Amino acid sequence: MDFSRNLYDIGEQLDSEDLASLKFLSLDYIPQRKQEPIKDALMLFQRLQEKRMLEESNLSFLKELLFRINRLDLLITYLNTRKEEMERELQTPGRAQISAYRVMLYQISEEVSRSELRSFKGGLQEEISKCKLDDDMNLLDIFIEMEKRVILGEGKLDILKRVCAQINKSLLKIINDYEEFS
Amino acid sequence: MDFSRNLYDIGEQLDSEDLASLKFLSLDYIPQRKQEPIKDALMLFQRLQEKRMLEESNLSFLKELLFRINRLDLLITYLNTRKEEMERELQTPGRAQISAYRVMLYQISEEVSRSELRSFKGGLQEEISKCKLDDDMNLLDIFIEMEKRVILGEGKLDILKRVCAQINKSLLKIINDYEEFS
Amino acid sequence: MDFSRNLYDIGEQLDSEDLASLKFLSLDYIPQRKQEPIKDALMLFQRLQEKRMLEESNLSFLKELLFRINRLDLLITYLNTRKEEMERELQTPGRAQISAYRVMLYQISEEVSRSELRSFKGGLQEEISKCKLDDDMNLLDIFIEMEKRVILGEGKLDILKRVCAQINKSLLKIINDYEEFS
Amino acid sequence: MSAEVIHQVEEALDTDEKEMLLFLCRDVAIDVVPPNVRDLLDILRERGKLSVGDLAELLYRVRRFDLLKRILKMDRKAVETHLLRNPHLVSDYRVLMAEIGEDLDKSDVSSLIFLMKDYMGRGKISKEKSFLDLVVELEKLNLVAPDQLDLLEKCLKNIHRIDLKTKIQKYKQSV
Amino acid sequence: SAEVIHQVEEALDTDEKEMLLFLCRDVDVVPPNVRDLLDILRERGKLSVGDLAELLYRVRRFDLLKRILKMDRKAVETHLLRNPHLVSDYRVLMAEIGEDLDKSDVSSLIFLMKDYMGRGKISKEKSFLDLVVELEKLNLVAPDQLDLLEKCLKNIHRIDLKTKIQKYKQSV
Amino acid sequence: MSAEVIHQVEEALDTDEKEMLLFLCRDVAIDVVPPNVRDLLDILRERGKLSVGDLAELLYRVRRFDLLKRILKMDRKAVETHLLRNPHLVSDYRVLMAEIGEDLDKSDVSSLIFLMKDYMGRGKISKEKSFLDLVVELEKLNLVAPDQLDLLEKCLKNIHRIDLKTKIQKYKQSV
Amino acid sequence: MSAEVIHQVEEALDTDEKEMLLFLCRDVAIDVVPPNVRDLLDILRERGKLSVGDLAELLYRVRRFDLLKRILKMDRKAVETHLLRNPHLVSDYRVLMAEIGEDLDKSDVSSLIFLMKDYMGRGKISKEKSFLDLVVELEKLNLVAPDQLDLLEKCLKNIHRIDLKTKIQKYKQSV
Amino acid sequence: MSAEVIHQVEEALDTDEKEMLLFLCRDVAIDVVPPNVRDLLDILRERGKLSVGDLAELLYRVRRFDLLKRILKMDRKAVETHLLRNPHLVSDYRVLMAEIGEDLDKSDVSSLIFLMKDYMGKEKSFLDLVVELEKLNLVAPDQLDLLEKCLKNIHRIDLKTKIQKYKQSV
Amino acid sequence: MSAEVIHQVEEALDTDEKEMLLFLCRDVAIDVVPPNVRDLLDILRERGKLSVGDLAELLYRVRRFDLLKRILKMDRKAVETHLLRNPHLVSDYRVLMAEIGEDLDKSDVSSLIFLMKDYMGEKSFLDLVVELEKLNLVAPDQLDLLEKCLKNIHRIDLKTKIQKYKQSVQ
Structure with missing residues (x-):
């Protein structure tokens, strides 16, 4: 049971915030109902195994997930993969199992502070009730709610650009780079 | 219940900053998953007891931990041990359960003021997002993040030297002494 | 409801500096962990009531604490006790509950100005790190740190006299008087 | 509906x-x-x-x-x-209590719960509670009533506040 | 076998x-x-x-x-x-919708649908599939008409699943 | 057929x-x-x-x-x-009882059986019953009738449920 | 007729x-x-x-x-x-036994049969039987009589139900 | 009724x-x-x-x-x-335990159970703790040394005074 | 009786x-x-x-x-x-299993179940023990699997207990 031991060892090094980041980054393969009861990395790994995405002979998805959340130490320590190999592999078309849209959204979420979060919540109060704009809701929850209310998506980005135009300017540069990726 | 009473008395004198230092000094034996839900020293003592590193017949680790953070009154009062005995015991090879690298990091962390802390934050903007530039973050969290992103490993210290070169020379002296140690 | 009303009336008058002085003067009864969350006189009064040292029948401790901080008006107004009676009670052996060591430390803290404080900070940079020698620190913080590092105590006073000999001689007189009394 | x-x-x-x-x-x-x-x-x-x-x-x-x-x-x-022109669904006492509770900050509710600590217990008041919770707790012990507000008025007097006392007296005269 | x-x-x-x-x-x-x-x-x-x-x-x-x-x-x-012999598209779509609703959403759905359904009929702490089969029994949601389901789903501020319904209906 | x-x-x-x-x-x-x-x-x-x-x-x-x-x-x-345009095989009283039983849940039927456990046998309704079974048991004692409904209305009012009482009154006024 | x-x-x-x-x-x-x-x-x-x-x-x-x-x-x-106005066809003892059996639930009759399995047959009462069957079995051994109810009172007390014992005592004192 | x-x-x-x-x-x-x-x-x-x-x-x-x-x-x-006038049903022991448990906050009970963890093996309340201690035959109306000692150990002397008053009354 | x-x-x-x-x-x-x-x-x-x-x-x-x-x-x-003085009814192995099961938490037993799910095809520790006994994997004389699993989850105290019990039989 070496594989289970390695997976448990990897899961012991992830805290609540990283678990939430992984849960947000794995929306395309785990629906809301299967995602709500998840409170630890072991449940997420079991769910990934059930769909035959993570196994002994297929570690690509786990490597990608651990690379995109920037936890580069676990890759070298346990999975035995350096940064150069992942950087070379990801840029090859057809070898990325996570859409660039989600990565861009998470990168944007990384660059928001508490004051910026409050400004973002105040700006987007037009179409969202104050009950869903509570202090518990972080930026990822706001993005998920916007996706649910079909005001933000792959084809819909004007609202995000307009909202980000007030808080900062480099966010528009990131969005333009993502558009260049298209 | 003399032993439990003694442990409670020792844990009654440790405030938040000393608790954070103690948690940082013991990352080699407590993963982040157990690190997160710790708010009082009693839980840390229980976690240490669960690994047979602290009990009635073995108190070396507690003495080392209380000596490394410069708290000698507790040692002389609730443990009956003086400075010279601890120094001689630590000088003996094979008795240091805490790596010298962690002690060097903690000593560096004690030698930074607020303005120097802001300068250090500014000098590390290259490889770290602006979200960690918050006033809440101390130097220990920066060190933890750098260790996470494999830029402050035990074998790799060039980045730390380059950053510290713009603040003070005593930090470089400490780093050079640590390198001469091993 | 009269006794609690009187306690609240007493607690309203005190300011932040008097609160810090009272917190320092009661270190022998309230540990650091319970000392940290105290931010107002009501919390300290509740802490004292927990240990059964302040109540309707027993009011010696509060009167002594008010007298030791040169607050005679509160003693004569909200406690109905004169200065001479308190001095006579304190002069009785065994009646005083605060050790004279803390009293003389507080008197020395009173007898030091800002420039003298900076000179004291500069004089003991060898045995105390720069972070603990921060500008916001007062003489009481330095005394607490020295007590923690077992360099200043009842049995050890060489460092205190050595440092104080370069500032003023009245402090030496106070130290000699304390030594003679002990 | x-x-x-x-x-x-x-x-x-x-x-x-x-x-x-x-x-x-x-x-x-x-x-x-x-x-x-x-x-x-x-x-x-x-x-x-x-x-x-x-x-x-x-x-x-x-x-x-x-x-x-x-x-x-x-x-x-x-x-x-x-x-x-129609009977009220909620009594004036409840709306008075709500109005009084909306005029107090965090620095005063602690003083009130400290003043009346003898009647209640330490565990009951450990968490931060608004004035409404304190009013409910007082009502449970049958200390405050719509036709009996002396204790609350005196307690508000003890914390050096007069306008709330004027409001209480105005409501009492309104009865 | x-x-x-x-x-x-x-x-x-x-x-x-x-x-x-x-x-x-x-x-x-x-x-x-x-x-x-x-x-x-x-x-x-x-x-x-x-x-x-x-x-x-x-x-x-x-x-x-x-x-x-x-x-x-x-x-x-x-x-x-080659051929979907056993199951049909309608049941697959119903399962897809049911798998995308959390506890709060189904609780709100049962609260809204308590209007013309008995309290004991729907009871509480049920899944979306149970509500679907109850509506099937009451004969108001069928592969020919889904307007009531679409309206109820829109009422709880969930428009993406309304798209899903629109795409499925326009597929034929 | x-x-x-x-x-x-x-x-x-x-x-x-x-x-x-x-x-x-x-x-x-x-x-x-x-x-x-x-x-x-x-x-x-x-x-x-x-x-x-x-x-x-x-x-x-x-x-x-x-x-x-x-x-x-x-x-x-x-x-x-x-x-x-046909005679009713089932009387309106039975369908009214069925509707009332439909509009009740566990948290109410438990209260009903606990309250009315005194009149009938304690072990008679020891097993968990529904509202229909309780109505049958009451009918066996000739307490609730197609023309007499005061007892049922009183029991429904005792559990703080008024809309069903209004429905009962509406059915009574229908005749 | x-x-x-x-x-x-x-x-x-x-x-x-x-x-x-x-x-x-x-x-x-x-x-x-x-x-x-x-x-x-x-x-x-x-x-x-x-x-x-x-x-x-x-x-x-x-x-x-x-x-x-x-x-x-x-x-x-x-x-x-x-x-x-007419002599009773059924004895008061029989109706008292019937009422006691009605007031007892299955969880208690299980306790009675388990407790009294020692006096009676080891597996005679293993089959699920109500309180009336147990009373009949006891009467078969002539252990309980209309003038002999002390044993039944003790057995009823052994299951922590004192109201039935008070009812038995009331019947005994009345007659 | x-x-x-x-x-x-x-x-x-x-x-x-x-x-x-x-x-x-x-x-x-x-x-x-x-x-x-x-x-x-x-x-x-x-x-x-x-x-x-x-x-x-x-x-x-x-x-x-x-x-x-x-x-x-x-x-x-x-x-x-x-x-x-009439004799009471609940003993003075139970009401004393309720009085003690009312005045203990959520932090002191954790320290007390940490002190008691030697004698035994999880959001506990003081009522559950005293019930568990009673199950092991350690705290009884006749034996109150353990509770008084541990209440003194955690720097809570008013509860010790209450226990002493109860012992003096009986 | x-x-x-x-x-x-x-x-x-x-x-x-x-x-x-x-x-x-x-x-x-x-x-x-x-x-x-x-x-x-x-x-x-x-x-x-x-x-x-x-x-x-x-x-x-x-x-x-x-x-x-x-x-x-x-x-x-x-x-x-x-x-x-008198002979025991239940072997000390069952007592040791019960003692171990009394110390494990919910997260620890969940991690143990996840680790051991490879060998087998909510459950408390006792259910896991009886399931393992059903497959003839854990026996009163052999405890390598349980000891290794306990060591892997950083709970070395129970490993020490198991080693002490193993030394006791010889």
Whole structure:
């Protein structure tokens, strides 16, 4: 049971915030109902195994997930993969199992502070009730709610650009780079 | 219940900053998953007891931990041990359960003021997002993040030297002494 | 409801500096962990009531604490006790509950100005790190740190006299008087 | 009337006024205790004591006129006239307690819970509680009543506040 | 082809079993037990290797497909593309909707639908599939009309699933 | 009409609705007490009181429109029109009782059985019962009647439920 | 009176009350054990000890007022007056045993049979039996009598139910 | 008395007071554990130990005076006089334990259980802790050394004074 | 000895205590699995394997000293002397398994289940133990799998306990 031991060892090094980041980054393969009861990395790994995405002979998805959340130490320590190999592999078309849209959204979420979060919540109060704009809701929850209310998506980005135009300017540069990726 | 009473008395004198230092000094034996839900020293003592590193017949680790953070009154009062005995015991090879690298990091962390802390934050903007530039973050969290992103490993210290070169020379002296140690 | 009303009336008058002085003067009864969350006189009064040292029948401790901080008006107004009676009670052996060591430390803290404080900070940079020698620190913080590092105590006073000999001689007189009394 | 309007009102309310709404309706439904706003509204609907006018009055009490305009399509003038010419669903004592509680900050509720610590216990007051929780706790021990407010008035006097005492005396004379 | 059915039924989940029963409601009264349903399906001759593989594929349990039935995703995908003998598009869409609603959303749905349904009929702490089958029994949601379901789903501020319905309806 | 349709109806009904069907048919089949639905249907068919219209009315009264559209190939409009211009096999009292039982949940039936456990045998209703079973037990004691409903109204008012009391009053005023 | 009315009354009863009716007539028909309800009723009627009033009392002892009003056309007041003005067909001890059995739930009869398994057969009472069957078994051994209830009182006390013991003591003191 | 009073009492009380009532009534129903307060009150009514006075006293111990003023139509003076005259059901031990557990916050109980963890092996309350200690036959109305010692050890002397007062009274 | 004694024992126990007692008496339930604890006590009584000392041993092995003192009129010293002098009913291996199961938390047992799910095809530790015994993987003489699994989850204290028990048998 070496594989289970390695997976448990990897899961012991992830805290609540990283678990939430992984849960947000794995929306395309785990629906809301299967995602709500998840409170630890072991449940997420079991769910990934059930769909035959993570196994002994297929570690690509786990490597990608651990690379995109920037936890580069676990890759070298346990999975035995350096940064150069992942950087070379990801840029090859057809070898990325996570859409660039989600990565861009998470990168944007990384660059928001508490004051910026409050400004973002105040700006987007037009179409969202104050009950869903509570202090518990972080930026990822706001993005998920916007996706649910079909005001933000792959084809819909004007609202995000307009909202980000007030808080900062480099966010528009990131969005333009993502558009260049298209 | 003399032993439990003694442990409670020792844990009654440790405030938040000393608790954070103690948690940082013991990352080699407590993963982040157990690190997160710790708010009082009693839980840390229980976690240490669960690994047979602290009990009635073995108190070396507690003495080392209380000596490394410069708290000698507790040692002389609730443990009956003086400075010279601890120094001689630590000088003996094979008795240091805490790596010298962690002690060097903690000593560096004690030698930074607020303005120097802001300068250090500014000098590390290259490889770290602006979200960690918050006033809440101390130097220990920066060190933890750098260790996470494999830029402050035990074998790799060039980045730390380059950053510290713009603040003070005593930090470089400490780093050079640590390198001469091993 | 009269006794609690009187306690609240007493607690309203005190300011932040008097609160810090009272917190320092009661270190022998309230540990650091319970000392940290105290931010107002009501919390300290509740802490004292927990240990059964302040109540309707027993009011010696509060009167002594008010007298030791040169607050005679509160003693004569909200406690109905004169200065001479308190001095006579304190002069009785065994009646005083605060050790004279803390009293003389507080008197020395009173007898030091800002420039003298900076000179004291500069004089003991060898045995105390720069972070603990921060500008916001007062003489009481330095005394607490020295007590923690077992360099200043009842049995050890060489460092205190050595440092104080370069500032003023009245402090030496106070130290000699304390030594003679002990 | 329907469930849709109740759901919209519940989801359009923040957590700040939810405690206000729970406390305000204690006298209407005193036999049971509701856990959340939706259950309270459902209980009133089942009991037959909730209608368009009652909901309008409750929304007017909590100072949320925008919800009245958007949802119920009513202005404060009509509901005020109806309140004047019809019996009130909520007593004046509850609205007085709410108004008093909205005029106190965090630096005063601690003083109040310290002053009356003898009657209550340390565990009951360990968490941060608004004035409404203290009023409910006092009412449970039968110390404060709509026709008996001496203790609360004296306690407010002891904390060096006079305007609230004037409001209490004004309500007492209004009886 | 008899003992493997025991392993399959013992390797499933309660909510998975409920979804399986809902999917198999298309093909008589459904037995309360999954084992009895499998036995009846084998008795009728409808049970087959391809049909069972497609049924397990419809619930996203590929680990059991490779573990027990010795089949991969490509083979079952091709077999389904050839012909969907057992299940239809409507039940798949209903399962897809049911799998995308959290506890708060289904609670709000049952609260809203308590209007013209009895309190004991829907009870509480139920899944979206139970509400769907209750509406099917009451005969107000059928593959020909879904306007009431769409309106209720829009009322709870969930428009993406309304798109899903629109796309499915416009597919034909 | 035939036996195959009877069997199909029997197999397509769950356990919960079987009790409702038995309760609704108690008045019509009073000579014997049936233990199962199939025997009751056979007796009604033999007696000549079972027909397409009667079965359609019975299935409409249990809210199973899909079986009407599938087995009997009739929709809601046709059965409603047939019911409007035909004598009612089931009395309005029985359907009112069925509706009241439909509009109650566990948290209320527990209160009812706890409250009215005193009048009847404590061990008689020891097993968990539904509202229909409690109504049957009350009817066995000649306490609730198709013309006498004061006791039921009082019991419903005792549990803080007024809308059902208004429904009872509406039914009383209907006659 | 007639055979048809007796047949209807017999078939109208359920399976649960059949055992009660069999037990209550043990003293009246003591010469021969009754095989079923119909034979017992026929023997009682042919011997002249059963009449309309006796049948009304028997139905009153089982609390079936609906059958009394529907079939016998007699309310509770008439049968109560008839019982008051005529000698009792069933002994007070039998009706007391019936009431005690009714007031006991299955969780308690299990405790009784488990506790008293030692005195009686090891597996004689292993079959699920109500309190009436246990009383009959005890009477078979002549351990409980109308004038001997101390053992039954102790057994009832052994299950922590003192109200039934008080009722037994009240009956003993009254008679 | 009647089922109406019991139903109203069950509806009025919240969860913490229900737990306190269960602990207080644990002594009389020492042989049967009631899962719900409804079952406990039904058992007391069946055993004949529940009356108007006993119910009033039980509600007074939980410190719910509004229920006495509303349901039982009694004031605290009458129930106090009845307690002073008629013997009380719950022992002074149980009310003393309730008094001690009322004044302990959520942090002191954690330290106390950490101190007690030597003798045994999880959001605990002081009532559950004292029940667990009683199950092991360590704290009884005859033996109170452990609780007094540990209460002194965690720097809480007012509770030690309360325990000393209770011991002096008996 | 009498029926009421075992009746009181069955009624006073708790659900977790009932499950632990049912598991701990697995050796003597070879004839049939007892669905209920009262049925198990009946089987033990009728088979001649139950007595005052045996019931005292069972009550002592589940940490219910209050029942020992109140019901059977015994203390800890008496039952310890009885255990020392008279032969044991239940082997120490079951006692060790129960002791280990009393210390593991919910997260720890969940991680253990996840680790061991590879070998096998919510569950408490005792259910995992009985499932492992069903597959003939863990035996009273061989404990390599359990020891390695416990070491892998950083709970080395239970590994020390297992090593001490293993040294005890030799």
